[PDB]
Design a protein around this ligand. Sequence first.
Ligand SMILES: O=P(O)(O)OC[C@@H](O)CO
Ligand SMILES: O=P(O)(O)OC[C@@H](O)CO
Ligand SMILES: O=P(O)(O)OC[C@@H](O)CO
Ligand SMILES: O=P(O)(O)OC[C@@H](O)CO
Ligand SMILES: O=P(O)(O)OC[C@@H](O)CO
Ligand SMILES: O=P(O)(O)OC[C@@H](O)CO
Lengths: 234, 225, 207, 220, 215, 238
Amino acid sequence: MFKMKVEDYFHDILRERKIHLTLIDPEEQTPIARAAIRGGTDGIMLGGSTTDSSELDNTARALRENIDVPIILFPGNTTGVSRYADAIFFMSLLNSTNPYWIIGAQALGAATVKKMGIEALPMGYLVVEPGGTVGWVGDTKPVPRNKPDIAAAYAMAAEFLGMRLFYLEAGSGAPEHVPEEMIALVKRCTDQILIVGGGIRSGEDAARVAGAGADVVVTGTDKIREIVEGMGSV
Amino acid sequence: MFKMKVEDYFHDILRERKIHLTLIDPEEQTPEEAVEIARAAIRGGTDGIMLGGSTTDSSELDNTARALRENIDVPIILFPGNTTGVSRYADAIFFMSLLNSTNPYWIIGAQALGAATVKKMGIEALPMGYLVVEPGGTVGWVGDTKPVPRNKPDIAAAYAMAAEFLGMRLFYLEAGSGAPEHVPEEMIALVKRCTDQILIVGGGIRSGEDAARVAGAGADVVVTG
Amino acid sequence: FKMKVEDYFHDILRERKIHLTLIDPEAVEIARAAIRGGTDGIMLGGTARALRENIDVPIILFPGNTTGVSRYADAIFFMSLLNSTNPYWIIGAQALGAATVKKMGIEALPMGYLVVEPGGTVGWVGDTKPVPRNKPDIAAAYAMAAEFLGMRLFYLEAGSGAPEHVPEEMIALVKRCTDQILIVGGGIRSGEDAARVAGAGADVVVT
Amino acid sequence: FKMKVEDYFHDILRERKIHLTLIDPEEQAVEIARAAIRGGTDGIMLGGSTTDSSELDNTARALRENIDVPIILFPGNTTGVSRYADAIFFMSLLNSTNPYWIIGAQALGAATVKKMGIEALPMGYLVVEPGGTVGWVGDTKPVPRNKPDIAAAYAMAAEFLGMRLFYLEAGSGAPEHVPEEMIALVKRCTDQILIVGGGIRSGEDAARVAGAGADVVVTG
Amino acid sequence: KVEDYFHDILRERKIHLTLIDPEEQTPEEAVEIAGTDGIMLGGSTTDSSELDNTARALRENIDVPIILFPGNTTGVSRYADAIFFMSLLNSTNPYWIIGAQALGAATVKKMGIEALPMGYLVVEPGGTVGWVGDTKPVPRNKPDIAAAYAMAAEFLGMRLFYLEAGSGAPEHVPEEMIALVKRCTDQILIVGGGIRSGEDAARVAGAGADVVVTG
Amino acid sequence: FKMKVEDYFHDILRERKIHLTLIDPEEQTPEEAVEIARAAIRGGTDGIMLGGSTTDSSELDNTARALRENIDVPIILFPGNTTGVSRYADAIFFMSLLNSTNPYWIIGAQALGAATVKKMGIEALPMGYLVVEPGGTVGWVGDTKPVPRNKPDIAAAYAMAAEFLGMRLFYLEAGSGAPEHVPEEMIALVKRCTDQILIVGGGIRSGEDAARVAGAGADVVVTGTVEDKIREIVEGMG
Ligand SMILES: O=P(O)(O)OC[C@@H](O)CO
Ligand SMILES: O=P(O)(O)OC[C@@H](O)CO
Ligand SMILES: O=P(O)(O)OC[C@@H](O)CO
Ligand SMILES: O=P(O)(O)OC[C@@H](O)CO
Ligand SMILES: O=P(O)(O)OC[C@@H](O)CO
Ligand SMILES: O=P(O)(O)OC[C@@H](O)CO
């Protein structure tokens, strides 16, 4: 459970340091969080995939009882809403060619998010030139790694549309994380909480990305203390 | 000129009454004539001048905008139909997403292409969800939309709620220029109940009676062209 | 509920036409009323509804999205929204939801899903071009293509609350052109509405 | 007298693999068919292009004269139908972003197929990286070679939709054939006749693709 | 020859074209159907051999041009005099705009067939081609949209423009819209749709249409 | 007094191949843009293309005005959107992005901008616009499926389709800053199949790039990213 707003919780940490989140997939796990908190994670991301909304419920239920960091929903589809979470990344897949992933899915799930109490964090979601499975399923045109002006352009548009958070996604298991240059440019152009995930395995991966401008660092694939150490090194 | 935040000005008015905006098209008359229309429209007690509604030459836009910014003291707000709808002579821009388009260009593409320009200029950006209702008019057709049916307010509410969650503080229920009937009072009423958005309404609003129903139905802002 | 619903269907179709009751999500009372009214099954579409249990007719999931899969059901109309303009509703959603259907035991009935004018809400959310009521040649064309692709079931959807049900001409023509279990829904309120649809060729009626 | 092509296929699959030879009507030649049967092909696939339906008819007629194995149409558009064939791969290009290649073209060509007697084998058609010309013309998002889970997802969806055959397409002339992992995975997940084509030139390529799970191998 | 055939006639009067469908009657019956100035052959995506025989049957027995009116790549046949090589402009599907055309271009070049560049626009309600073509029919109350497309088509080099109400359409491409489109471009303006009565033809032709098509 | 731009082209094409210099208004001021033009003209460029980006039309006008004052070669608009129209130009490439998956870039944008082009005096040159691998930013923004470099038949197919639809000009686009220009084989095939003024841009930096591209069949050569480099390029094309 988490008493207060997750968004204020984020600003609270950001006064002093950078934020780390651990991404858990229910299909893969059985209702790791505790280990990642012993490493120094500041929150648990839950979802990322299209899977039956009951393995989610059980994993979500199990977590809310036993951990004291926020559970934030990371929906890969409308199957990603669960009342047992503390907040949801209410995201738009901005660089999709399919309106379903941009606003369609979002419209169908809004009543569910509202009927429940869940805090909704507005987030622009942008796939970078590898992109992993989400890039493919999300019908995206991945942003080339050497075209940061494009990423920055979408970051600026997201902000003007009211999205206070921006997520640079290289896709799960990306060989290399989002380019340092791309992150820096986005940080230069907006006042958004800049989140970066994908391909971040080593503390050095975390140092480069954190140093590049990222306010938040997401990881799914202790390794965590190595990572969180890395993000402190800068 | 207007100097201060157009959004605070809106909230200032909303404490006491509902807002009215006049939509002028640069394509349809000369800059002098629009000032005439504008200056005239201020006599009714309009609270601002919306400028756009069409995809047209960005030089007529500039010229009409310049002429207005000099001669009126109410806010000049851009109502862009494309990236051609941006001008530094305006006080704010409705930075809008055409939510029920089947084409990503009208949802995020155009917005992405014009954002650097909007930031390079000083223009204040009001985040706005833009939703076309049946019949949808010309913008419905050009915008590659599936107009929200008039007997499907649940759909309107669904997109309005999502817009809010995405950070869009304003919502525009658009029936399109020359709409035979304004957006149904039912749709407006439901949308107002479900969100904490400034609910803007345009399309087919001609008479005071239309304005009484639409405003009375829940609309915080009414637009007439 | 043992066992195959497709066999349950064929067994009945030997003697009469099938009726299915569509429940939208918890009042068991509605199912039981329609079951003593002589319905042959419960369609469940928009979520547990473990409440059967209390029923002895099949529970068939009628999904509006990937959120429509539940292990307490007996079968799923595993459907493709054929006349959608969005690949998501034709095969995309189906591909993302396929593993769950296999992970559970749920029997999957292959079904073509076709929206007819006016199309209702499913037509709109589904990004469809509803088949016009005076264009049955199109309906038949899609029924045949669906069948050639292996879809043994075909669903003529006018959308919930349709002012008029699917045209009689359209139903008849599709049945003449294929060897499918022909389901028709939308706008069916009166027995007379049910008389037209049933008489025209429909093997299954939904209300 | 003549048996169905699907039944013909199952008869072989009881004992051994299955091989089909892909002929393009546009590119030339009953010589090629006759030659490939002496090698041990089990059938002749006819198509691969969107091209005039007269080059097809003529090639189909000539073939139907000189061989005793099935002629199976492999259509690139509604122009790929000819009454001189024994069966048609009635396919949906599943990972296309364009509804025309998924169901639209199929809807337009259906009556023509019905008017003729042609046996229609229901087949899911999936383009794998790199994808070749069909990948480009077909408006596809090729399934990446290290994302077999995606391939398996579509094989399962195809099956649930009634498609008894599944075609893993790497595109004509692809440098690498569809990966063994993907083939292995897709065969594990469905009870479909699993066809695999593209880039299979050497005997080793066919041994690997066959060994990985492919029930049918295609060579053009 | 066929484009010149057209310009010569329009000097004095308006052109009329008769639309015959190969699917709907036998070639003998088709030769029979043929004061019309030409025979259009198509309207559908249909068996491509029904096309060939009907074209042959036509090509021998008449002295007016047989002009292909393709609904898809199945619509090219070597026995015709000309082809409307057309783009379905207000389609949401790139296949009907340029995709099909690219797939069919080599066939047209391989034959000698004369290709007339034509913008093809479905107007409300639009009929079957509008539906199959994945169109957003131009509303009957928006001639500005039609004209905008007529102008863009012309700038792209399309000398002919076709205002389509759809086969069997209950009502006209509207009087007006034709007028506006004619005012705004220098194209050979073709109109089809539910033109049934002699009264309809006076209206459509008089309104600005250079060409009237009837099936 | 002034000559249409297409006739200007035909005149040069009687004897030699054409060179055009592509300036982006966003990337430098009008003063600096005049410098590029004037330098590019002392090297034998035959014209100045104006566009290349989706950017506010006030930088365009100012760059366009400044040019119209100081040079006597034609100013041709190279629009990236309807914001790419300026009344101060001599002609516009009225183009369709043929291998886009989005109808907006194929005809939609063109339809919304047509009234403006007609209302102004601007000469409209009909042009098929085809993005080749890698495609650059326009390939990405334009929602394209870039023609693979080993698929000249695809390029030729669209070139043939463009011509039949009345498009007298064809542009093979490798994208700004492309590591390598459009393949020779691809250009050759496109020239063999049509009688279009065949334009090629992208990745053309050196005189050899231009010699090879020119030699392959290209009637026209566009270059932007790179001042008297032009003299090498125009030399190469001889
Ligand atoms: O590659 P990993 O570390 O699993 O990252 C997951 C990705 O979804 C974060 O955005
Ligand atoms: O009905 P009018 O007065 O044209 O106003 C409609 C306007 O909201 C369209 O943008
Ligand atoms: O109109 P009813 O009877 O509810 O039927 C609708 C159903 O077929 C689809 O939801
Ligand atoms: O011609 P190849 O490369 O063998 O490929 C066969 C077929 O699968 C391609 O359509
Ligand atoms: O059959 P009608 O309604 O006369 O029209 C046919 C032709 O106009 C179709 O383009
Ligand atoms: O690589 P450059 O020289 O900038 O050329 C690109 C230009 O041709 C865009 O089409």
